[PDB]
Amino acid sequence: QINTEYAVSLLEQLKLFYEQQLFTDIVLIVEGTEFPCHKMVLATCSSYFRAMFMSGLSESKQTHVHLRNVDAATLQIIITYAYTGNLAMNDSTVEQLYETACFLQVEDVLQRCREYLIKKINAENCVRLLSFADLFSCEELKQSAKRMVEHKFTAVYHQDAFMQLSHDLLIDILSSDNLNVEKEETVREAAMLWLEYNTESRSQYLSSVLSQIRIDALSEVTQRAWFQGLPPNDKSVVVQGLYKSMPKFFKPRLGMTKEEMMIFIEASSENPCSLYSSVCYSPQAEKVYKLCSPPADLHKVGTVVTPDNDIYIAGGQVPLKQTAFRTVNCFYWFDAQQNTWFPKTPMLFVRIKPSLVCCEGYIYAIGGDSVGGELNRRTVERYDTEKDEWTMVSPLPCAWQWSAAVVVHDCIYVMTLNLMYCYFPRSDSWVEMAMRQTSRSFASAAAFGDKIFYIGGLGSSVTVEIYDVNKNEWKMAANIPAKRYSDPCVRAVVISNSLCVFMRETHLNERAKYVTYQYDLELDRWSLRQHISERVLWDLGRDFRCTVGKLYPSCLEESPWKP
Template sequence: MDHKAEEKRRQRHSLTLLEQVKRMKESTEIIDVVLVAEGEKFPCHKVVLAAFSPYFKAMFTCGLAECTQKEVVLYDISAESVSVILPYMYSADLRLTHQNVQTVALAAYFMQMEDVCRMCQKYMMDHMDASNCVGIYYFANHIGAEDLADRARQYLYQHFAEVSLQEEILEIEFQQLRTLIKSDDLNVSREESILDLVIRWVKHSRQARAEHLIELLKQVRLVLVSPSFLIEARKRNTMILCNSECNDMFEEALKTIQLSTQPSLSLRYGMETTDLLLCIGNNSLGIRSRHGSYADASFCYAPATKKTYFISSPKYGEGLGCVCTGVVTENNDIIVSGEASAVKRSRQKTRNIEIYRYHQRGNQFWHSLCSTELRELYALGTLHNDLYVIGGQMKVKNQYLVTNCVEKYSMEQGSWRSTAPLPLPLACHAAVTVKNKLYVLGGWTPQV
């Protein structure tokens, strides 16, 4: 018997065992233990529980009372989480939702099921947005999930302007909010959003939170708030107007602003950014260099100051032969794509789309990020720091065909995978991200 046949036989054997145990669970055959959570009973098999959970293995082999008990009561574990974890043990099917993922993660943590913990964390990472990142951050800290906490913290700080408008942030505790708004790392362009958040947080439960108003206002950099906003905020909120200490803080800030005294306060992260228009050149008929020759027209323009800054071209050295399209991710990574330079292409067996990322430090500003199967007239999009190569024209058996396929590149994992296709083949289109949604517009479809 060859190796592959033997491997298939073993796989069939394992699947048969799994299927039979699953059927016995469904028909409640040879049940030897019943789990009880929130009064709900779950008949199952000790051997399955022990195989997947070190917690249950220790329970059933320790020689204590649980070894012989027909029912095991699970305290502080929800019935819903047990109803999700048990099917996973019997069938590898873990049905996570936005509503149950945290309770399932807690139960898995209690049962010492590391695989389920990892899947729950990945689910929360993949579905993180402005409406839930605060809860995920504090939940991850609570259970000691450091990677998840770091990811949620980065998302929370990077998107704080949007997060501050969500209902979830109004539910956090005083010390949590104080620590947040004290940070220099919040990506907000205007201090008004911090002041507005403090007012909304206190008003959300005014009777219980009014005592914290002054301490929270001390963390707001009032001299960075526009005078009109300060005056309007005080006028519209009696809790500020009727508090002498709050009034004094506002008056002092207004005087400082009026005197144009430079505040000794550091700016927050988002206040030090500059909006730029990027032009990544594509031919040698661009801007004349200081040496007299023509270079690629790669530069950026700051509308606020009307200044132009020149940047290195991705076509230098063995970079791109041409630049087809580009995007800027939510982490401000500049990404361009095109086909390899002639020098690099001469060493390749197949032609690819080459994707480069701009680095602000080091001697080589543009670094190769990844590559994928060649197509033309495609769109490059970005969402949640993932890249999407969308549609375009591909050469199949010496014939050019317009495609609807979409490839997604995870910058975190460094891997490609196919994702949901376009509803129709499309070429010469564009992609844009607005409010966490990726839109495709324009282009043309092949004639039938």
């Protein structure tokens, strides 16, 4: 191999020459700023300077080149990267950095800024990044922007930059089958408002934008509104659209295929190769669709589903390369369509079984057997979904183990064996709450409306303690009627605007039975909503978690397994 010591010595000597200006022969003249540099470094880094000097043109012998349509700071950072290899990339100058990298065809920095932008893609810059990837040919960025823009924009459709988009880009966006919309009318009104941004600059594109939307809205309202905005005496558009909507037979999209499903993690892996897998139950389809394995079989993790219906994974441990397990603070995000886990910004401290709770767009991970264990062994930390970073919050006053947390009334409610503390995001403080009369642990709670339903606790039992936020008191309702001499595995969840329970029971010398019940809020009784047949759902285990979310049956595949 090439001697790295001599390579770094040569590089540092060249950078010293650059700083001291000894062997510089070519100077870059940009907006009156002198940039003394060499030809060898520029040729090695950029693919434009190699064609600027070794070409035989008038600049081959000229020692002063007036490089135009560039920026001084961008050129300076590119030169210093070419001379030392350090590329300091902030969150603002990456746009002009990519512009100048495409202006010098510097694939070295082009790849670096492409990776930075593939990491930086978020909701508030999705349309801007897609427009940037349309301006400069970049297929990876274009595809990532396609996916993220489709999802987040069809969720939001309010960005100001969406109005200033090319016709081809909008045709690609609207005609795609990856849009995430609960209805087919929101895309219609989004297209209408985009068209009405201008009057005559969009008339020619009117015949094309309607060609990608289904005819179910091409004969109903929002056709006379276009006639109102039609240019005067234009008889080539009204009669055109009058007899035009014959083709494009109505085909349902993919965004209207989200159903309230119970996502399960760390289930009993059918194949012994994996230790744990992930499955999902369909309360409506009455089937069990398989889910992608956790990233690097990440066990002992926590789940959260934001009000925007997004799944996240935090904490967990990976078997170190017989008992062998090491805890990692890696963070991941689940793609609802690609059926894969996209990595995100990792946490600061590793966790085991963390309680992920979403509130005000922030992901809160409370506790989880942190590595530190100092006097603040109860330190909790939130995540920024806008800036893609983690921020510490007010620590929990008391150290708790095997706890659960929910969000009610824009506040974090973490529950332990007998104590409860409410966190105020506005003031970053903890307030003492009501005290339970029973010592129970290893249970889960579901936030339904303005009440907290702590179900089960210790196997578990059928004890239920209902807490009211407005009343600040713990009261008993009833006990779930289950078979005696059994060990039910209770799982509290909210589904169909009602509090249902996923309770798996096992009898003596008998296999586990799956059945869910609907708890009557006013009657204080668990009614049999549906019985899960064992012909579709097999054993899941004991350390499995359940959460409420929506998934697409089309993108996912049915798990092939014998009843």
